[PDB]
Amino acid sequence: LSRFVETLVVADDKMAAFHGAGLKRYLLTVMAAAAKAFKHPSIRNPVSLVVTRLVILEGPQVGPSAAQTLRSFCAWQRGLNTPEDSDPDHFDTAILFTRQDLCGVSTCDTLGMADVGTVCDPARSCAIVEDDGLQSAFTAAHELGHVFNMLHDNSKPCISLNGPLSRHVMAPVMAHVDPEEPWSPCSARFITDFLDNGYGHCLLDKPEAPLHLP
C-alpha cells in the first residue's frame, strides 16, 4: 500500500552557475513541493517522492530540443544506476533540472518532457524540467505524472473521466492549479490503474537514507 519513489535529482552546470551555493537547498525545496502534490488525496493512490541521490554537474547533452535532451539524459542516467533495487544506490526515477530553454518542434513554450508510464523501467524512468525559478515544482509534478502514465486532461479519455465541468497538474499548459484538487479524476484513474496493473512493483521498498530539508 505504501509506495516510495526513490529519486535521483540532477542539476546541470547552468543550474549551478545561477543558484550557486543555494542550489542543493533549492532542489530539495522544489522536490518537497512536488512530493506534497503526490500525497494529496485527489491522486487516489498516494506515493512518497523521496530524494535519495542528488547530482550537481561527459554528462548528458543539454540543448533546445526537449526530445533530444530527454533522450540524452535518459541514456546518461542509466550509467549511474545499479542492477538491483535492493542496492542502496539504486534509484527508481531520474529527474533533470536545467536552465536551458527547452523547445518543441515549433515553439519554446514547453517547460519539460518525460517518458510516459515508465516508473519501474530503469532504462526509461526519466524526466526533464526547465527551471523557471518559481513554479518548477508544478512542472516536476506534471512530468512525474506522465512517468506514472497520466494523460493530459484535455485528452479524449480524460473528457469522459473528468466530466464537462484547466485547473489541474495534468493540464496541457501550466495554469493556476486548484489547491483542493491538484489531480483530476482522470489523473487519479490513470495512476491507480497503473499501480493496480503491477507497473509500480519497484515502489514497494522503503529508502534507507532520504535527503531531508534539515
Residues that constitute the known binding site:
142, 146, 152
User: Interface with ligand 3PU includes 117 (CB under 6 A)?
Assistant: no
Q: Interhelix angle for 23-39 vs 136-147, to 10°?
A: 50
23 is in the binding site of which of ligand 3PU, Ca ion, none (Cβ under 5 to 8 A by kind)?
none
Residues 59, 133, 163, 172: which binds ligand 3PU (CB under 6 A)?
172
Residue with the three cell numbers 464537462: 164
Sole window of 25-33, 88-96, 115-123, 167-175 interacting with ligand 3PU (rule: CB under 6 A): 167-175
Of the candidates 199, 211, 12, the residue with the CA atom closest to the CA atom of residue 92: 199
143 is an active site residue:
yes
Residue 134 identity (one-letter amino acid): L
202 is in the binding site of which of Ca ion, ligand 3PU, none (Cβ under 5 to 8 A by kind)?
Ca ion
- Angstrom distance (rounded) from CA 52 to CA 78: 16
Sole window of 19-27, 85-93, 103-111, 196-204 interacting with ligand 3PU (rule: CB under 6 A): 103-111
In sequence order, the β-bridge partners of residue 98 are 130
Q: Which of residues 187-206 bind Ca ion (CB under 5 A)?
A: 202, 205
Sole window of 25-33, 74-82, 136-144, 205-213 interacting with ligand 3PU (rule: CB under 6 A): 136-144
Of the candidates 201, 199, 177, the residue with the CA atom closest to the CA atom of residue 85: 201
User: Interface with ligand 3PU includes 97 (CB under 6 A)?
Assistant: no
Residue with the three cell numbers 547533452: 61
- Angstrom distance (rounded) from CA 77 to CA 75: 6
**Cβ atoms of residues 28 and 116 within 8 Å:** no
10 is in the binding site of which of ligand 3PU, Ca ion, none (Cβ under 5 to 8 A by kind)?
none
What nine digits make up the cell of 5? 519513489
* Binding stretches for ligand 3PU (CB under 6 A): 66, 104, 110-114, 138-139, 142-143, 146, 169, 171-174, 177
Question: What are the residue numbers of the active site?
Answer: 143
